[PDB]
Amino acid sequence: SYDRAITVFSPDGHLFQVEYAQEAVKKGSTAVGVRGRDIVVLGVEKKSVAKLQDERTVRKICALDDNVCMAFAGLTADARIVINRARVECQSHRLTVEDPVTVEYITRYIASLKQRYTQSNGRRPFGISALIVGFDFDGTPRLYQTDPSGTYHAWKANAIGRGAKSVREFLEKNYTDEAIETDDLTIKLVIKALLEVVQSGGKNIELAVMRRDQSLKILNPEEIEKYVAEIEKEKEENE
Amino acid sequence: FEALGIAQPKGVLLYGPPGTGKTLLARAVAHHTDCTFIRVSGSELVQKFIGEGARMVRELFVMAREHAPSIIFMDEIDSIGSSRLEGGSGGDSEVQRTMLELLNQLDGFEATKNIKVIMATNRIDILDSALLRPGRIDRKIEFPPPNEEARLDILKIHSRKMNLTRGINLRKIAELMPGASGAEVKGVCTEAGMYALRERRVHVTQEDFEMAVAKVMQKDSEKNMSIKKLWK
């Protein structure tokens, strides 16, 4: 029919292969990114390793450059490929223009790459969705979401993967101007958004934070328990 | 069950590879129960006359209810209840009607009481989801091929009536049957007995069991080595 062909329009004008690739992201794992006044955070749901998998190489949050980071959801191999291409392009852009790559440019490159991978037969679309975060060299908080279709959008705080709709509604009901006044408030917001779907807390949660140009350090497993303890303390404080 | 606050489980499915003990377990539970056991082994509810299968299901359940707490054994349930096929034309529809009547009897508007039911099949994966659904079938029991200890137990059960010779090591025979169903173990016992019979003796030796294992478990392998070496 009209489904098994990437470059064939359906009678109702749908490229159903592109939509199927988009839906393949929903089978991934939840990843929410929030941008604040001075911080941008990347909260993802970490799959619990059974007994032997090395968490060091199950990387879900990866840094394209010193000024940009991103979290994906939907296909690990396609994600790895697009990550390598994104860092190669970041280095090439810094070679061509000598200034660090803005979040908009790298997001546009990723979107264009995925698009050019979904415009011809014999090229399966990249079945991942990316949440580009980082600061431009002028110091502005920008967050971007790239779709498997090859399009990108600017979000203040978006979620991808499975259960992304629920986290989206949570952020709609809880994203306020004062909620990003301090870094700890943004951390509380993103942790609450994650616990909306991954209710166990503690483990199964990975956070990466970006202040103004510090070469982000992913929150190591020594204060994530501390941060969730503060979250629980506040949770019993208001109730 | 009442004080626990739970609802009584109703049906169990006995699935597994053929010759593992499903029908044997049903026979045993029929032997050792005070309930009025019922054998409604599959394809007996498939009648030529239209709508007779559903009527037979209704009469079967009304009779099971009329008697004491009863047990219904649907052997080879794969036959009538497999999967509802889309549309008609060449698709089966009357057997689907009988199956749907059985489903509604099992867990429908009426909520039958004390009508515990047992079903068996070799292909659970092809059974319909509306039949495998819990509340209609709880505790889907799997009958895996016996391990070495269980194979030894089956050998000792089926060799109880034989005249074994002093020095028989049934443990070695059990170790000689990797991944062998219980039916194949019984067949091994029978073939060892026949090897004894052919020489017009009454006792059975270890060599007899060894050749019986070789004969019963004999199977066709991949003769072409080239095909077999496709995979590393």
Partner: protein, 140 residues
């Protein structure tokens, strides 16, 4: 290679009640009549003296079970399942030996090819050397 002839010879040299059926005969036009015929033939063998059931061309109905997607395939698999449950089902049979001959054993359902249903799968290979001499002598 002598299968049906051996069945004929068995029927000759038997004191049993011999019931001869062919596999395709079981498959009926009306729904549920094939399994009914299987039930009746096995019940006739049971209620009679020690009896023998010979089902020539068993693989006409006893092919390996698969995910049947139409009514006819479902009915044929129902016939096979009724055969299985009649041979080694809940109510065991006494003094009812069943002989079935086929050309393609490998296509038979594994549930049919297990001890307790088919205790012996006897191969009838093409005659070799001595067997060819014996056949030539007994035919000439």
């Amino acid at each position: 290679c002598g299968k049906t002839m051996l069945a004929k010879a068995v029927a000759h040299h038997t004191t049993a009640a011999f019931i001869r059926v062919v596999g395709s005969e079981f498959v009926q036009k009306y729904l549920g009549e094939g399994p009914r015929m299987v039930r009746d033939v096995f019940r006739l063998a049971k209620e009679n003296a020690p009896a023998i059931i010979f089902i020539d061309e068993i693989d006409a109905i006893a092919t390996k079970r698969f995910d049947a997607q139409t009514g006819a395939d479902r009915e044929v698999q129902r016939i096979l399942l009724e055969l299985l449950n009649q041979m080694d089902g809940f109510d065991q049979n006494v003094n009812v030996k069943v002989i079935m001959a086929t050309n393609r054993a490998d296509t038979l359902d594994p549930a049919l090819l297990r001890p307790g249903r088919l205790d012996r799968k006897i191969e009838f290979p093409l005659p070799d050397r001595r067997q060819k001499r014996l056949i030539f002598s007994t035919i000439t």
